[PDB]
Amino acid sequence: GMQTNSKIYIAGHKGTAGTALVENLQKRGFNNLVLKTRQELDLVNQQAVAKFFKEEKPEYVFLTAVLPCGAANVAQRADFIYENLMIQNNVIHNSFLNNVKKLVFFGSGYMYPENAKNPLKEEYLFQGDLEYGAYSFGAAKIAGAIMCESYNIQYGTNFITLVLNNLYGTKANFDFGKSRVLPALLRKFHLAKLLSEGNITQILQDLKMNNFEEAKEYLHNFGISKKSVEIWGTGKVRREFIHSDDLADVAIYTMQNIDFKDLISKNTHINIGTGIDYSIKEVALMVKNIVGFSGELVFNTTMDRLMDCSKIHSLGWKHKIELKDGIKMMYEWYKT
Amino acid sequence: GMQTNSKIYIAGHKGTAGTALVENLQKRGFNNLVLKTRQELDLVNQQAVAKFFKEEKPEYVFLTAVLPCGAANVAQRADFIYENLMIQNNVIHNSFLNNVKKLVFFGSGYMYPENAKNPLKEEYLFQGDLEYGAYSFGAAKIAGAIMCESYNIQYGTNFITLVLNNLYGTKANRVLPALLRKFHLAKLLSEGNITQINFGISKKSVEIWGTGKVRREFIHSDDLADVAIYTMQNIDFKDLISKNTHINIGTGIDYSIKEVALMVKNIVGFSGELVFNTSTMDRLMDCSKIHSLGWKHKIELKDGIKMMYEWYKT
Numbered sequence: 001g002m003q004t005n006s007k008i009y010i011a012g013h014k015g016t017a018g019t020a021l022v023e024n025l026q027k028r029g030f031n032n033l034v035l036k037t038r039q040e041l042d043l044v045n046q047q048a049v050a051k052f053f054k055e056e057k058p059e060y061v062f063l064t065a066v067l068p069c070g071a072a073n074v075a076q077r078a079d080f081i082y083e084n085l086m087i088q089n090n091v092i093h094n095s096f097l098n099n100v101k102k103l104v105f106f107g108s109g110y111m112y113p114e115n116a117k118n119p120l121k122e123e124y125l126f127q128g129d130l131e132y133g134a135y136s137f138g139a140a141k142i143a144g145a146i147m148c149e150s151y152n153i154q155y156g157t158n159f160i161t162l163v164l165n166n167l168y169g170t171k172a173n174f175d176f177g178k179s180r181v182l183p184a185l186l187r188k189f190h191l192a193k194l195l196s197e198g199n200i201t202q203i204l205q206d207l208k209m210n211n212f213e214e215a216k217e218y219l220h221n222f223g224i225s226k227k228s229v230e231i232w233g234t235g236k237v238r239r240e241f242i243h244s245d246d247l248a249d250v251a252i253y254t255m256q257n258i259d260f261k262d263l264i265s266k267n268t269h270i271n272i273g274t275g276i277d278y279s280i281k282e283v284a285l286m287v288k289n290i291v292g293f294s295g296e297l298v299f300n301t302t303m304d305r306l307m308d309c310s311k312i313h314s315l316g317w318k319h320k321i322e323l324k325d326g327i328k329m330m331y332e333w334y335k336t
Numbered sequence: 337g338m339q340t341n342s343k344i345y346i347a348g349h350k351g352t353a354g355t356a357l358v359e360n361l362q363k364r365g366f367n368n369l370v371l372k373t374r375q376e377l378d379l380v381n382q383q384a385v386a387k388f389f390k391e392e393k394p395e396y397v398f399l400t401a402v403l404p405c406g407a408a409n410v411a412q413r414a415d416f417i418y419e420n421l422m423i424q425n426n427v428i429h430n431s432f433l434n435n436v437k438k439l440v441f442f443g444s445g446y447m448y449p450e451n452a453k454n455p456l457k458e459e460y461l462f463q464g465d466l467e468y469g470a471y472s473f474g475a476a477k478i479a480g481a482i483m484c485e486s487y488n489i490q491y492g493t494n495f496i497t498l499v500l501n502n503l504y505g506t507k508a509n510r511v512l513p514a515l516l517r518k519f520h521l522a523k524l525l526s527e528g529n530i531t532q533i534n535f536g537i538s539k540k541s542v543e544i545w546g547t548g549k550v551r552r553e554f555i556h557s558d559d560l561a562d563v564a565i566y567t568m569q570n571i572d573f574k575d576l577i578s579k580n581t582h583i584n585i586g587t588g589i590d591y592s593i594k595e596v597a598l599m600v601k602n603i604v605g606f607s608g609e610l611v612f613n614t615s616t617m618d619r620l621m622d623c624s625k626i627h628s629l630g631w632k633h634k635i636e637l638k639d640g641i642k643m644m645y646e647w648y649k650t
């Protein structure tokens with residue numbers, strides 16, 4: 001499909017997936033990208049989106065823009081459904097109206113039933129109720145997948161949905177209270193190692209503090225000590241991770257090689273991932289070993305999510321970046 | 337809630353439910369109504385809907401507007417999801433932005449799994465796959481119900497979803513009107529009234545495709561208007577609790593297509609024969625929840641069909 005000079009729109013280009021798509025496309029020599037910040041183009045606004053498509057006429061679209069659901073903002077139950085449905089509707093429909101050749105949309109494993117068997121098959125859609133916290137976000141993602149398929153059936157569009165669980169990259173936010181599970185664990189174990197070695201000066205520099213008494217209390221409160229790191233929960237819940245370079249790779253592979261006609265007329269979405277999951281305990285141990293911390297884990301007191309990737313494997317794509325290598329890259333970056 | 341002087345918006349006011357809401361509201365003294373035709377206000381257009389709410393500031397909203405899915409237009413798989421999600425989103429979100437006091441949204445039994453047990457309980461949402469033809473339409477209806485509930489949880493709104501199976505009315509446009517008209521035409525043929533005059537209609541018989549064993553539940557539009565008004569006056573979100581807070585409405589009784597066809601035949605007075613040519617999803621609501629909240633239907637099917645036919649003959 002796409003050539004060097006094809007006009008390619010990446011919606012939500014400043015996010016984790018968006019940034020990875022822009023960087024990988026540029027590295028591969030694609031030099032006709034169209035990018036709009038949130039301030040330039042509000043994707044919830046139908047009139048602004050309609051005018052953009054009419055005036056710019058992109059040939060290919062990667063739809064990465066989202067209001068994401070997590071632990072910190074789970075109260076925004078109405079916003080997760082309204083905003084995500086509007087972004088999906090505005091982009092998908094105006095792509096159709098302006099003769100976009102092909103579009104890739106990203107779904108979430110929260111679209112599958114809370115009690116579904118792992119590994120999750122594409123045909124598990126609608127086989128039971130969704131998890132409570134992510135209920136409205138998951139429902140929006142189902143509607144996005146069904147929208148893509150419905151345009152493909154009625155109008156012969158080529159709009160493909162790729163569904164993933166947890167995304168990470170080399171460059172992460174390591175601020176406490178703001179960091180996801182991998183960067184948070186990495187920083188905890190790095191600090192614990194410094195404590196065990198008696199490197200007071202480096203602790204103060206890492207934390208941006210000038211009083212060690214205050215530093216020791218902050219570490220003690222976040223479960224960090226010279227002998228152990230404290231982990232909330234039993235450590236038994238299992239998670240699958242995909243590196244953003246692998247997300248970019250499969251998205252571009254799909255655009256170039258996988259058409260709607262190859263998938264058929266229900267459950268035509270495609271799961272993506274590495275096909276391997278890890279308990280929180282196993283992840284913590286891997287991080288401990290990469291950092292080189294000589295101490296222990298301690299636990300203080302239930303839905304697993306792992307894709308069945310049989311479909312995408314059958315279509316000729318597999319991941320390159322194993323989780324231990326991805327964590328290693330993140331740690332090297334952190335130390336700069 | 338509503339007072340007789342409260343400003344009330346009925347979206348989609350020319351349809352079957354809309355017409356009945358307008359008439360029943362006016363009969364009770366609720367005359368401060370705001371009504372817009374499709375030509376005046378396209379509910380898929382976000383900018384037009386946002387401007388309408390800002391200018392008119394309705395206090396109460398009945399959302400009846402829809403692109404309906406039937407046998408004749410089942411090819412419109414994309415339009416069913418896109419158009420219905422846009423109407424729902426535009427009306428619900430702009431109601432919130434403009435401090436609407438209460439809203440009623442109408443769902444469909446196509447939101448429930450194809451193989452769910454009848455009678456259908458509210459908790460059967462997401463317990464299996466939807467019927468293939470109605471898959472995209474049912475998905476849109478699920479999103480509408482979840483949108484109402486999500487605004488109620490995050491923002492403390494009072495947006496209530498009522499879910500039904502088959503609507504018919506005195507002033508109506510679909511299975512019941514079509515059977516009524518088929519039998520009326522057959523009767524006219526047998527009486528030789530050419531002036532007044534492949535659908536299986538002849539002077540000696542009406543032939544219906546299928547076994548006519550499939551079962552359907554019907555609600556008369558005056559009963560839909562009655563329960564919608566009852567909900568506005570008496571049922572708040574706090575009374576329903578925090579999941580599956582939609583409410584089934586209906587009569588609680590179903591009929592095979594054969595039984596319905598016979599009832600219509602007898603009311604019309606066609607003297608010929610009914611024939612089924614034999615070359616599967618039932619839909620009946622469990623109405624225990626709405627009954628527990630203090631409403632039940634008044635119009636039995638035989639009487640409702642009689643009302644519809646009298647109107648038709650004018």
Ligand SMILES: NC(=O)c1ccc[n+]([C@@H]2O[C@H](COP(=O)([O-])OP(=O)(O)OC[C@H]3O[C@@H](n4cnc5c(N)ncnc54)[C@H](OP(=O)(O)O)[C@@H]3O)[C@@H](O)[C@H]2O)c1
Pocket residue numbers: 011012013014015016017018037038039041042043044063064065066067068106107108109164165166167168
């Ligand atoms: N673990 C994961 O991150 C994960 C797991 C499952 C699926 N996914 C899916 O993968 C896709 C990409 O996720 P991500 O992690 O890369 O997202 P992200 O890092 O949260 O980025 C989202 C981007 O969308 C933009 N955006 C949101 N609303 C907008 C609006 N109204 N107008 C314009 N731009 C808007 C944001 O702009 P601002 O920067 O201005 O805020 C941001 O740049 C999404 O569809 C997501 O659901 C990701």
Ligand SMILES: NC(=O)c1ccc[n+]([C@@H]2O[C@H](COP(=O)([O-])OP(=O)(O)OC[C@H]3O[C@@H](n4cnc5c(N)ncnc54)[C@H](OP(=O)(O)O)[C@@H]3O)[C@@H](O)[C@H]2O)c1
Pocket residue numbers: 347348349350351352353354373374377378379380399400401402403404423442443444445500501502503504509
């Ligand atoms: N009918 C049933 O058996 C049944 C069963 C299940 C649930 N329901 C639900 O009950 C509600 C009422 O159904 P109904 O049978 O009364 O519907 P209806 O007779 O089909 O009426 C629909 C109305 O919506 C209007 N409309 C559609 N798209 C519009 C748009 N873009 N802008 C403005 N107006 C628009 C139509 O205007 P025009 O007249 O100009 O086209 C029409 O007046 C719907 O939510 C429906 O899903 C009905």
